[PDB]
From Swiss-Prot, chain A:
Record-linked Gene3D superfamilies: Ribosomal protein L39e (1.10.1620.10)
Signal peptide: none
Record flagged with keyword Ribonucleoprotein: yes
Keyword Transmembrane assigned: no
SUPFAM superfamilies the UniProt entry points to: Ribosomal protein L39e
Single biological process term from Gene Ontology: translation
Organism of provenance: Methanosarcina acetivorans (strain ATCC 35395 / DSM 2834 / JCM 12185 / C2A)
One Gene Ontology MF term: structural constituent of ribosome
Protein name: Large ribosomal subunit protein eL39
Cross-referenced PROSITE patterns: RIBOSOMAL_L39E (PS00051)
Family: Belongs to the eukaryotic ribosomal protein eL39 family.
Superkingdom per UniProt: Archaea
UniProt keywords, alphabetically: Ribonucleoprotein, Ribosomal protein
GO cellular component, one term: cytosolic large ribosomal subunit
UniProtKB/Swiss-Prot annotation, chain B:
Membership in a protein family: Belongs to the eukaryotic ribosomal protein eL37 family.
Protein name stated in the entry: Large ribosomal subunit protein eL37
Organism expressing this protein natively: Methanosarcina acetivorans (strain ATCC 35395 / DSM 2834 / JCM 12185 / C2A)
Disulfides per UniProt: none
Signal peptide: none
From Swiss-Prot, chain C:
Native source species: Methanosarcina acetivorans (strain ATCC 35395 / DSM 2834 / JCM 12185 / C2A)
Protein name per Swiss-Prot or TrEMBL: Large ribosomal subunit protein uL29
GO cellular component, one term: ribonucleoprotein complex
GO molecular function per UniProt: structural constituent of ribosome
TM annotation in the entry: none
Gene name tied to this protein: rpl29
Keywords (A to Z) from UniProt: Ribonucleoprotein, Ribosomal protein
GO biological process, one term: translation
Family recorded in the similarity comment: Belongs to the universal ribosomal protein uL29 family.
Pfam families xrefs: Ribosomal_L29
Highest taxon of the lineage: Archaea
Swiss-Prot record, chain D:
Region Disordered: start-end pairs: 153-196
Keyword hit for Ribonucleoprotein: yes
Family note: Belongs to the eukaryotic ribosomal protein eL15 family.
A GO molecular-function annotation: structural constituent of ribosome
Composition bias type Basic residues, residue spans: 159-172
Protein name according to UniProt: Large ribosomal subunit protein eL15
Entry keywords, A to Z: Ribonucleoprotein, Ribosomal protein
SMART domains with a match to the protein in the record: Ribosomal_L15e (SM01384)
UniProt-listed InterPro entries: Rbsml_eL15_core_dom_sf (IPR024794), Ribosomal_eL15 (IPR000439), Ribosomal_eL15_arc (IPR020926), Ribosomal_eL15_CS (IPR020925), Ribosomal_uL23/eL15/eS24_sf (IPR012678)
Any Pfam family: Ribosomal_L15e
GO cellular component, as recorded: cytosolic large ribosomal subunit
NCBIfam families: PRK04243.1
Amino acid sequence: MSHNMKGQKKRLAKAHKQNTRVPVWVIVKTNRKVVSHPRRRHWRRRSLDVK
Amino acid sequence: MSKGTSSMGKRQKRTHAKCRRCGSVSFNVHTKQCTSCGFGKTSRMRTYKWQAKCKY
Amino acid sequence: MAILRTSEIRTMTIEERADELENLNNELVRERALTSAGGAPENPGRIGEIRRTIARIKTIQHELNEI
Amino acid sequence: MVKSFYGYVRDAWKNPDETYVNELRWERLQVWRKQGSVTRIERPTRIDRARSLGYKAKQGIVVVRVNVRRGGLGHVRPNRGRRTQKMGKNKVSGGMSIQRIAEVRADRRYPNLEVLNSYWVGEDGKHKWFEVILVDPHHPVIKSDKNLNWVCDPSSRGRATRGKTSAGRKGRGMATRGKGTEKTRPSIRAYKSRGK
RNA sequence: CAUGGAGCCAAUGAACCCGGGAUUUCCGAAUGGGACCUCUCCGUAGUGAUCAUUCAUGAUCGGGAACGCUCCGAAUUGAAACAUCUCAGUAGGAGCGGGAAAAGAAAUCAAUUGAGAUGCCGUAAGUAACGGCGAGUGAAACCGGCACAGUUCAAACCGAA
RNA sequence: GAGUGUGACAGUCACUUAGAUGUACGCCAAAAGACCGGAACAUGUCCCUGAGUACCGUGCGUUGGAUAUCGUGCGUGAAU
Ligand SMILES: [K+]
Ligand SMILES: [K+]
Ligand SMILES: [K+]
Ligand SMILES: [Mg+2]
Ligand SMILES: [Mg+2]
Ligand SMILES: [Mg+2]
Ligand SMILES: [Mg+2]
Ligand SMILES: [Mg+2]
Ligand SMILES: [Mg+2]
Ligand SMILES: [Mg+2]
Ligand SMILES: [Mg+2]
Ligand SMILES: [Mg+2]
Ligand SMILES: [Zn+2]
């Protein structure tokens, strides 16, 4: 239970909501040309450089 | 205690925080300076000629 | 057509513009609350057009020195 | 003869140790040592020198006395490899003269002004004193003045820091024309600093 | 970017482009105070620092690809070693600073008698000069062009005109 | 008859091209007016014309600058 300030937790929240798959409708719209993005990660890996 | 993997378990802290000015995690928490942009040392942006090669 | 055009906003009075701004804010609150449950909006473009109408009303107010 | 009193001031300061200026010097150096680095004064000590250098009794013109240490470039001995020609630094005085050092310190103290000129006003075994004339380019009195409103141009900002005063041009080897100025004019940097 | 669904906008002329406005969170020169806290404290609501003026007001600060000016300043390397020399006033550093900057109207260059501000280009010329006279370093004037532009103070005399 | 697009090779399909038009704010800008004013000569026990400056000594850097580069540290230091 490390203790974050408001901004550190906001940056963690942004990192968390960035770690989502591309929407299926985006894949349909681009005709399978956009299927991923570079901000995918896993929590148990090389950590965030955010906080 | 080995200088290798054993001593690397004590890495539960930081020497550099996120910089207000530039966003780089380069703000030395002890010297209170950003080693990337120079924030906390100068009102200007840290730049050196040796950051590139001699343009010739 | 749209909710209300620039000519409509400039034709109204100060109190009328404030009342319409409050009503648009209420409609935006209701529509965003509906989407809080995850469910799709009944009118997907309505939210964006409400927001842009609110912006247009605020711009007319700022031009007219009301805000 | 009918000579102006500026001529008498000039004569008194020609050989100061032989005139009444020596006793004034003895009394003044105590006060000047008590003061700091850059001191503003109401009137120039040597009015004739200031007036010939461009001083006028008008708003936007500031005169300051600057204190600079004596000797050459206080230099550190290198702690790495040098070839015995670059090892020694005690006898290496600089290429920046004491007067231009005083002008630049005056300029640093007054960011909104421009250095016009400066003159020697005293010295002892540890210090030299110069009085630096500075102009306010943003004062309407200076703007109206057609003998000074050139200082309001964009190229006149940072005069002392770019060697454009009389002392700076003396330090750049551009005090004379002809032979000896092959590598000095139009700039030191234009000839790879081989002049000076 | 990026034709998927569902809607919305648009002939009250949208989209788009040109010009002009508005909005413009927090940090940042960052400047009410404080930042391992991009937030937080007082809230007396904030002209931070240094300066000019009569003290109405004003200036400076950060950024900009390179270029410009001022100052500080190596070594590898070459000399088939190496120390003067060379590398080189290079690399790097500090300050200033504009669309350009610097220079600039001879206490000059000439030579027997001439020219006539400065800059830049060509040439002089790898010449003169320097140099373990080794390796190397290395001009200028004359002359041909580009472009041309001259002036302002200090003082004498007057004395607030 | 530059080219690009268009279901294969396009002067004549489309955008163009050659050539003409138009354009708010701006920028330069000639005629014509207002204003401080300019240039020669004569006379001379007349007045003025820039100082720690120019020069010099010595040390160092720098320079092709050689007893003859420039700089600047110390010392010294004029003339009218
Ligand atoms: K060798
Ligand atoms: K060797
Ligand atoms: K074709
Ligand atoms: Mg170790
Ligand atoms: Mg370079
Ligand atoms: Mg100081
Ligand atoms: Mg200029
Ligand atoms: Mg700047
Ligand atoms: Mg060798
Ligand atoms: Mg000049
Ligand atoms: Mg050389
Ligand atoms: Mg054609
Ligand atoms: Zn930073």
